[model samples]
Target: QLPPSLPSDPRLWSREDVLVFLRFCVREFDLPKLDFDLFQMNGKRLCLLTRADFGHRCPGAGDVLHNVLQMLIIESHS
Candidate 1:
């Protein structure tokens, strides 16, 4: 069985980090709103934003951007 370890430290995001995330959300997901709920770190809820929309909206958004967004979301939750 796995031990109940404490959560990881919450990463303090830089302005650049936030900007990049917000840009991705907007450009890719057409996500006009950056609500707190959208920042849910744990994978409890399916992301209301979809990859298809992201691809369709912003073809410029690539895997690297996607990974960064995912990391930012998870880190923010910590």
Candidate 2:
């Protein structure tokens, strides 16, 4: 069986990885709520989405999501 591990870097995330990360973020950040369907895409696709895009998709929770995603994306390079 696979270890209980989550992708540390968002840049290499698949759709599945993105899902897991989103779930984690939801709980981790205690976000209001988000529609998962709005973000059904891979990490590379996610990478292209601007902060405004996140707000457009998730409304009130967008800033938190965008902040966490930006943190992870920055970590991926180093």
Candidate 3:
């Protein structure tokens, strides 16, 4: 992922981290916009997403990001 490490972390993401990731997604896919739910615990921010989440939000978008992620994984190991 261009952050290139953190793939093994929990599925959640910090808002700041999401911003960085969205930048990569937008750049790579020419996305129009980004949106997702924000969960909180004890008045703090918590956001977690999987490809399933994106698929629920918008299947086309989910497919694109999912495929891109796979490409990244294969590219990395090559």
Candidate 4:
């Protein structure tokens, strides 16, 4: 299940917006991409990574994920 507070507008968003949202989802949910197929409701490719992917490389991985998801959703709408 998705979070109740997930942003509804992908447009009118900033890089920081993306980061915060992704971080919240990652920290609050159980998203296993390797074991289960992950996808967006709008039929776009979603790249979801685990903490191991951020090991030493990403200090704020949640932000990165959030930004990417925002971009994808925005692009899809366009």
| Most accurate candidate by TM-score | 2
The deviation in Å at residue 41 for candidate 3 is 15
Order of models, best lDDT first: 2, 3, 4, 1
Off by over 4 Å in 4: 1-7, 30-78
Which 10-residue window in model 4 sums to the lowest lDDT? 34-43
How far out, in Å, is residue 47 in model 4? 12
RMSD of 2: 3.4
Winner of 1 and 4 under TM-score = 1
Per-residue lDDT of candidate 1, residues 1-78 (tens digit):
111131222143433444444454465655444443334343222223456543543456534345544664576566
Cα lDDT, all candidates:
0.42, 0.79, 0.52, 0.43
Q: How do these models rank on TM-score, best leading?
A: 2, 3, 1, 4
Model 4, residue 53: displacement in angstroms?
A: 15
Pairs that collide in candidate 1 are: none
Report the lDDT tens digits of candidate 4 across residue range 7-56.
45544344444444544556655433321112112212233334344333
TM-score of candidate 4 against the unseen true structure: 0.31
Stretches of candidate 2 exceeding 4 Å from the true structure: 1-4
How close to the true structure is residue 57 of candidate 2, measured as C-alpha lDDT? 90
| Model 2 accuracy (lDDT, Cα) | 0.79
Q: What is the C-alpha RMSD of each candidate to the true structure, in Å?
A: 11.0, 3.4, 6.1, 10.6
lDDT (tens digit, per residue) of candidate 3 on 13-61: 4555555555688776788665644222211122234568557765557
